[PDB]
A = this chain, B = another copy of it.
Amino acid sequence: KVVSWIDVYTRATCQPREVVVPLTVELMGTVAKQLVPSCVTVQRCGGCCPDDGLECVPTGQHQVRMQILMIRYPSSQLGEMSLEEHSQCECRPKK
């Protein structure tokens, strides 16, 4: 399996991309468990910039409500966690 440079570049270049976020881990908030799943997948800006000085950052955002099953043995309740999801990204000086 050989991947063409174009496909490699276009795909590695700064843009929004599904990222895994660890619940009870990423955001210091709620470091406790009982969550199913204990992590979620959310679009974010990732990749690299044509310059070692630039950085990949959002230029379009919005919160997404992720339904998360919360559990305390007898009762399992579908709760809702919210987080920042990116829709547009750009390369720019990490000053």
Q: Which of B47, B50, B67, B68 is within 8 Å of A41, CB to CB?
A: B47
Interface membership of A60, Cβ < 8 A: no
A66 CB contacts on chain B under 8 angstroms: 2-3, 8
A4 in contact with B46 (CB, 8 Å): no
Q: How far does the Cβ of A10 sit from chain B's closest Cβ, in whole Å?
A: 9
The contact string, 1 if C-beta is below 8 Å from chain B, for chain A 27-41, is: 000000100111111
For the complex of A and B, the 6 pairs showing the least CB-CB separation, nearest first, are A39-B48, A5-B67, A12-B37, A2-B65, A11-B41, A38-B48
What is A's interface to B at a CB cutoff of 8 Å? 1-5, 8-9, 11-13, 17-18, 20, 22, 33, 36-41, 46-50, 52, 62-69, 78, 80, 85
